[PDB]
Write an enzyme that holds these catalytic residues in place. Sequence first.
Site, short mmCIF file in Angstrom:
data_model
loop_
_atom_site.label_atom_id
_atom_site.label_comp_id
_atom_site.label_asym_id
_atom_site.label_seq_id
_atom_site.Cartn_x
_atom_site.Cartn_y
_atom_site.Cartn_z
N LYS A 186 0.84 -1.18 0.00
CA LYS A 186 0.00 0.00 0.00
C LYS A 186 0.89 1.25 0.00
O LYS A 186 1.41 1.67 1.04
CB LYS A 186 -0.93 0.00 1.21
CG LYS A 186 -2.31 0.59 0.91
CD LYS A 186 -2.28 2.09 0.63
CE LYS A 186 -1.88 2.89 1.88
NZ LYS A 186 -1.67 4.34 1.55
N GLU A 262 8.73 1.19 11.56
CA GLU A 262 9.81 2.15 11.38
C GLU A 262 9.09 3.48 11.52
O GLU A 262 8.37 3.90 10.62
CB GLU A 262 10.44 2.10 9.99
CG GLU A 262 11.53 1.06 9.84
CD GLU A 262 11.01 -0.20 9.21
OE1 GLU A 262 10.14 -0.10 8.31
OE2 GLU A 262 11.48 -1.29 9.58
N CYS A 296 13.23 10.60 8.37
CA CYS A 296 12.95 10.06 9.70
C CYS A 296 14.13 10.28 10.65
O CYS A 296 13.95 10.57 11.84
CB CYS A 296 12.63 8.55 9.60
SG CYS A 296 13.91 7.52 8.79
N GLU A 393 8.84 15.83 16.08
CA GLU A 393 9.36 15.70 14.73
C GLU A 393 8.63 16.71 13.81
O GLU A 393 7.42 16.66 13.63
CB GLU A 393 9.18 14.26 14.22
CG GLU A 393 9.65 14.04 12.76
CD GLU A 393 9.54 12.59 12.34
OE1 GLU A 393 10.59 11.97 12.07
OE2 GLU A 393 8.42 12.06 12.28
#
Lengths: 494, 494, 494, 494
Positions: A186, A262, A296, A393
């Site tokens: 996906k 992750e 990330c 973040e």
Amino acid sequence: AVPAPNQQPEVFCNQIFINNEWHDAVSRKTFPTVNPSTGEVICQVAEGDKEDVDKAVKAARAAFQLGSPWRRMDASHRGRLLNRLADLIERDRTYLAALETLDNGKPYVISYLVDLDMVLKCLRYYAGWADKYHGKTIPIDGDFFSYTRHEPVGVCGQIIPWNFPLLMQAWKLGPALATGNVVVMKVAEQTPLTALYVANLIKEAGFPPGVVNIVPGFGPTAGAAIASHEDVDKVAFTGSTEIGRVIQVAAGSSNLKRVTLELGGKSPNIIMSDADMDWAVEQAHFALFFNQGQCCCAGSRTFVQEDIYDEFVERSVARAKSRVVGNPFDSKTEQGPQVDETQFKKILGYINTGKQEGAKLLCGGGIAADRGYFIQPTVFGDVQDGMTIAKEEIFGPVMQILKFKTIEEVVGRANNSTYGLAAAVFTKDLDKANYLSQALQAGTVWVNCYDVFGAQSPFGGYKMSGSGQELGEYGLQAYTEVKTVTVKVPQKNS
Amino acid sequence: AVPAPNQQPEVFCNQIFINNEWHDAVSRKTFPTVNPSTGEVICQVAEGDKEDVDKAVKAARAAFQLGSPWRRMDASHRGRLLNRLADLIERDRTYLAALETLDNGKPYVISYLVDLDMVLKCLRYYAGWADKYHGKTIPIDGDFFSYTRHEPVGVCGQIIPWNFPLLMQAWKLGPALATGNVVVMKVAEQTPLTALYVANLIKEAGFPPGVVNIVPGFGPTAGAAIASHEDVDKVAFTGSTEIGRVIQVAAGSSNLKRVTLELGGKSPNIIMSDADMDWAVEQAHFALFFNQGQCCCAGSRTFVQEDIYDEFVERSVARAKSRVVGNPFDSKTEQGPQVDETQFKKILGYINTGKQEGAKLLCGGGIAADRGYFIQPTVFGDVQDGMTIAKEEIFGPVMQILKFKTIEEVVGRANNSTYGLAAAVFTKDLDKANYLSQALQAGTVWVNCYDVFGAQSPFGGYKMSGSGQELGEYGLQAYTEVKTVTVKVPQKNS
Amino acid sequence: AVPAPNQQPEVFCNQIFINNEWHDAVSRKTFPTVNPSTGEVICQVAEGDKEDVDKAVKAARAAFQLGSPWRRMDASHRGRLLNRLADLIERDRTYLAALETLDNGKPYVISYLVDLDMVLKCLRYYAGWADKYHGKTIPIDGDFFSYTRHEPVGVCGQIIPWNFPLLMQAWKLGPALATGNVVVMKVAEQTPLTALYVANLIKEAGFPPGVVNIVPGFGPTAGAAIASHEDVDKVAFTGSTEIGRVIQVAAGSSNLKRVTLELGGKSPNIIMSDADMDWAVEQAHFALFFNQGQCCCAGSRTFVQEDIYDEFVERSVARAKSRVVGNPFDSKTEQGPQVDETQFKKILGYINTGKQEGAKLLCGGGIAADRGYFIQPTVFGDVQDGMTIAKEEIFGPVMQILKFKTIEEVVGRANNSTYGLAAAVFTKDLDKANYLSQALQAGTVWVNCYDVFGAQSPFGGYKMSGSGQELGEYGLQAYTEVKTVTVKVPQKNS
Amino acid sequence: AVPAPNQQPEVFCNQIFINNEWHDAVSRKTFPTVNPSTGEVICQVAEGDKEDVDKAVKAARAAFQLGSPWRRMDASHRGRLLNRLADLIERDRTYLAALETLDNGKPYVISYLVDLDMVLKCLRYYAGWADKYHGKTIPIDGDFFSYTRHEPVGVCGQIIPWNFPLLMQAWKLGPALATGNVVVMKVAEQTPLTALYVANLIKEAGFPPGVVNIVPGFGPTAGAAIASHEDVDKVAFTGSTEIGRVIQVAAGSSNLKRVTLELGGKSPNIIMSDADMDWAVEQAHFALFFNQGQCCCAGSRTFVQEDIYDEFVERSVARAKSRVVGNPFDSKTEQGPQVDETQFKKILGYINTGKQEGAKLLCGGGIAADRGYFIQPTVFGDVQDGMTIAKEEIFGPVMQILKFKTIEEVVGRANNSTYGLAAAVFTKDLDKANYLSQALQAGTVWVNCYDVFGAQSPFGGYKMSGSGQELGEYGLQAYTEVKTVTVKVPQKNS
Ligand SMILES: NC(=O)c1ccc[n+]([C@@H]2O[C@H](COP(=O)([O-])OP(=O)(O)OC[C@H]3O[C@@H](n4cnc5c(N)ncnc54)[C@H](O)[C@@H]3O)[C@@H](O)[C@H]2O)c1
Ligand SMILES: [Mg+2]
Ligand SMILES: [Mg+2]
Ligand SMILES: [Mg+2]
Ligand SMILES: [Mg+2]
Ligand code: NA
Ligand code: NA
Ligand code: NA
Ligand code: NA
């Protein structure tokens, strides 16, 4: 030497890929994918949902049946296929890099020299692992012969984000296929195009129908359908920590499928007073601003020892002010737009929070253009640990510079985070480097460098940055099931 | 904290050990073993020769027969036996340490705190490996099931030197027994006593008869008989480069038995200008003088950067002058006598060679006592690469200090040697340490330390310093035979 | 589907390959290579000797210097180069298979579908290992960080035989190049052509000058020059047991270079009474007759259980009588000529010996044509263990059939041999298969099959059949040097 | 030879173990633990809940601090400590076996000879692994040195069941402690005693305070507190599939801690027509009835080929009828009572369901005694796949025998289950054994044997039987974190 890009690459694939065939969504619905540099719709793409996922899962399961072509195929041949796929992606490198830039926003020069190069290196790396991940023969007690078979886990659901579309697809396909699994992928709604084109190459390479299925669509629909599916054996997810929790709960509430995550990070980049100043400044800039800050492992907390703080900041600001923002297809552009409007607004909101909380705005701080989702390279100085921009973040071109005094102090501050994806240390001292690399609670610690990835070295986070690893030999573990076979023998001898 | 020693330990074992029992030589011949501190005979020992080796090999072969107790024994149980042996050695630690010092000459404090500790750690480490050295299941092409069995090589001849009697015995027995081999060991004629007493403990521990056989005697007789034996499957040798050649030739001319060699060296200890002076001086002293200079990996070429040469030399000379030479049973003694008259003379010859070729004698250079084989700690300054003392292994308390200017230069000089056992680098700089550890052509490279061995870390040389490794997981390779079993199956699936 | 062969392929390479260039021998001498099917000279080839070997070693040593292109090259790139070579070999597959057949004698259909396929699979398998043979980080006692680096051994001498020219070259180049070594290869005087052509492809693939050097010539000259060379770090040899001894002695007498040997065998193929008759008969025929009976692992001792002996022999004789011997370029040919006149006469002599000693000649036994070196498929029945043809490696199309009664009997008889390369067991019973596979003292034990090789599975012999292994992960061990680096750290933590 | 047991062993430990000290629950509440053979209370045990788990976690976290004795301890020493613990457990073997039987109900002879023996073997196996689980040095592209450190995961919550109290505790502590983690263990409320005594031995062995903490108590209280704790890094759970789902959901809903699950099964034991009848009958009996049928891997689906069905069933019934049920302390007793009243009733309910659905009751079927929780060995014949007793884990002395015709058929029926913990195959045929071992979807496949466990061989389930593995080298993966350290170097060379 980068070949001239087609700034308006044609789109050939925009449907659901199942059994090596293209399908419209069962509902016939489509969703638009936008060019973030202009804010204009590129094309419509089939909007997959649960029913489409169901079709994909069934095709994957069929392709995984004992005795099927994929199951009977020699492991060495799966490697031949991965290598063929790589050769095809290389043939179409100029095109794929342009399409990546068009749908994602990253500079074409980068898509070509970095993303595409890494895709090729990752697939060719895993091709080599296909017939090398051995099981074991074990010397157990008694008159028995015992050994293990490393079998595929089965139907693997893979949900990926939009920051490195082609690379994320390769990071997932490589270990999964090398170990003989079947996939239901996906891709992100913001960047579905490049992945769909690769599916065309997968078919061309000769992979059996059903081995790789791709369902473009939204998260709460297609993505959740994969996570909660009763016949999906494992789900690999890369994205926000928030959705990561949703994925793990869905797996526990469905069929107890295996889960690997992750997630994000707030990675500390530590500059000791004895560091090479020029190198540390350029690397810290790269550490934070790479890929429009959408990494990330972005070095989003730049800790600088007090004796060099002032000079480091002064040079950092000068570099951020000189960073060229603009058309990603222009060879001089260093920074393209953010991926979409939602991210664009989220970043502006964090910038506003930085201002409100008292962080010192040194440069940038606003929109970089009237069109597209461009934001100015922004640098905040005198950042404190308790500030929102020092904890959350941002995923944008916003740099935080914090001052520290001792090595014992910075270890504690760097480690005082719910994240633990990566970290870096810049120093010339042997003992400081070893002290810090051991003490930092992170999955990856760079020394005198940053964002150095290799298909050979694993990448996985600590704490809430996720579980399990990608790349390297370690990446094969999550895609393998261990079966012990223990046979009675007449009389065991050494 | 060291228990008071029995300076005149009684000798209980002085015969040939075969099938867990004591035997006189077939010829009834015995040879005297001397106490190097006094020059007096300790006792006589059975002098094994070819006929005794033949008996030992037959006993080892019988104990290795399929269906024998040692072959049928569970791998975990071999580990239990090794752990038991270690417990018995620890029980008799004080005695063994004194007996080691009496026959070898090394300080009792060292025999007890270093040698014995390392013997215990080696045996216990290897006990853990007994049931963990797995074979593999391999994904071969076609409809087959392929796997490997890690079987024992068989009858292993082990020839050891005199510098570390107990330790060398453990380094040899640990991996060989952990992997289920049988052994025929030939201990050094200069130091046979401690290994014969351990044989008594091997029996007490429960090892089946014939698993370990020990034949004390000389080299050209007992040693050569093992090397040329038609039924010995492998020979492991540690000693002089000269005899290593004779062994490899004997293996090729006899039955093509497998061979591993650990020979000498002329290891370079490099001190960069940014090193911690005090630490570097003390470690360089230790690197060369340890065990009366009788270490295969002795830092016999101390390269010192020119800017710190004068100070380093001045400090090294003072340290060498303060080194206490004397009765090894006295707690204040840092250096005992050399192992025997032959070595004593050889070292005196080398000292004279250094004086003749122009090396600057800074201290010592003569006999340190009237009785025994004591030599004064000796230091040569301004040594040049072409000098004999800078090229040949002296194996005594004779230090060579050479001056160098750049890192590129020292790499070349350090590597310009037929030996490649070990090397070291003292520096505070990260890049210098990594540049040197990679560039140095040696089996072991120490950084800011020297002679740091761990049962876990392998130890083997490059070039003419030998082949293969000892210690660690690598030490098991030379003691294992790999059998591949490939079976036709109805239909192979991943 | 096999492409029509050029029955008279043109020779493009017939000189000494050094630094990616072609050279005549320093002496200007050349030697003829013969076509075994006609007994005629194909062409002349430079006759390399010591001086030529000296030039190749110097070139290899230069290519291996620290900082050289080959040493700095990324491990993954060595993999890319190996894959490129494979592609070049596949491009010239039709030509190479023909040239192989011309110089060696084996059927072109086999050269093309077997030899060339295996060359490609070997090189491609090893290309995948280039960046995956990891070193270790070790939890040693104390405040240290310890790790190992797997470095290349250096200049590797490789001496190969004539039975599988192209494959033997691949088996040697694959692991050696994957690990970064440089090579000085001495091909067989009987079949130097195909290897020399591949040297041209090595240059075309992009390998740095000096990484692979090939010296065609004789054994006692060029071969011995390599084995005794003072600057060759390792020598891998495949051939006769007799020369293997000479090699090991040369190594010990020179610079103690590392040595690995792959010698002959007299492999037992055991057919139990419950085996599948038809399958066993065809497989035993294949096991012995494959490649004109010129295989190190040929099943030259076919043991058959008494209850099925008569039938098995009857069927075996019929199959041998039907075996088509003739022009290797003819699609109907199953058996080509023996490699040369020396082998041709040796085999005929063995056949005479078989008749003299009382073995029962069932078919064949003489020359198959008046031209070339063709021998009729020969089968001897009622062979006894003490017979010459049951002990010595014939290396020809001569089959030995022996009768046995019990499983314990056959195990002992199969094991009563100086060789131990391979063995096979044909049975439907689980326990019999496991009992035999464990008890047989052979490097490879096939079950219900024979001559099943995979790049993934190791192949090495026991006893006097050689030491060390080829193929699989294990093949990398002999081409790797292990360096331990131990660094003092401030405070070690788990 | 089993030492006479103390049928009424004294209880010395019944509190919460934290920091090597005994504490009452903060609430002061206690709960009774029952002797299943009499139905009487043995003693009261501290009832730990969330507040107690909080104290345990803080203790564990403090013992895991960088610089702590546990963190700085040499890996080899952790091995020493595990071996010491094993010695202490062996010293108290007779007592522990008795206490195990008292609290659990299993025959004392089995507790002593099986359970305690496996505990000792497990701990000693893992002691060996302590300093052998290496990280890697990786040949990544570019001028970098890259390696991985295998670090401990941290604070590990371990929730265990009641079927094998001591063994389950060992299976958990062995790998966790060998890899340097700290533990917060929640033992089963039904069998807390033996684990608590072992805690006393852990203190005696010398393990630092806070390394192992045990909290006796209930599942929804103490168990859930651990699973949802914000400072627990990993949770390992063994038990019901139902609670496994709860655990995974609590993890995803809390701090995304890592999770490993070891659930139940409905393992198929397949008997082919060519199996050794006597062996297969006895093994099938053991497979199902072992430990009162309270085994996760119990052979609860005995598939028997039609040609041997009648005789097999007949023999099975005879064996079940002769199985001695009684006082677990009596040496003749083969089967003791079920663990508690809840299990006792659940089993009786399943037997009732079996009768109602049409399964043929062949023997047993009711209560075996007036006192305790004893059930008669029950056997059901002609069981169909759709039956409840054929699908749900009964966890009692209730055998299901099903009939089948073909090997293809049984493969499909065996695999048609939500579970996949184990399976067995009884046959003398090589191809049938290989065909089935490959085709069965289970974590462990036994051939001609059952319940063969070895500390060396991994044990984990497929599908809903769990994820991850226990025992062997694989058991260390779940307790290790992988940190990658990538360092910039001047110039990388091979
Ligand atoms: N590598 C080492 O650790 C080491 C150890 C001791 C000595 N050496 C070197 O060796 C030099 C000479 O000392 P050495 O005479 O005691 O060494 P050596 O090589 O002669 O003896 C070592 C071992 O080999 C046996 N040996 C001797 N001749 C043999 C033969 N012909 N065949 C088989 N085995 C034989 C010896 O009896 C002893 O057991 C020393 O000065 C030193 O340079 C090296
Ligand atoms: Mg979202
Ligand atoms: Mg000597
Ligand atoms: Mg010859
Ligand atoms: Mg419950
Ligand atoms: Na887009
Ligand atoms: Na002596
Ligand atoms: Na020829
Ligand atoms: Na109880």
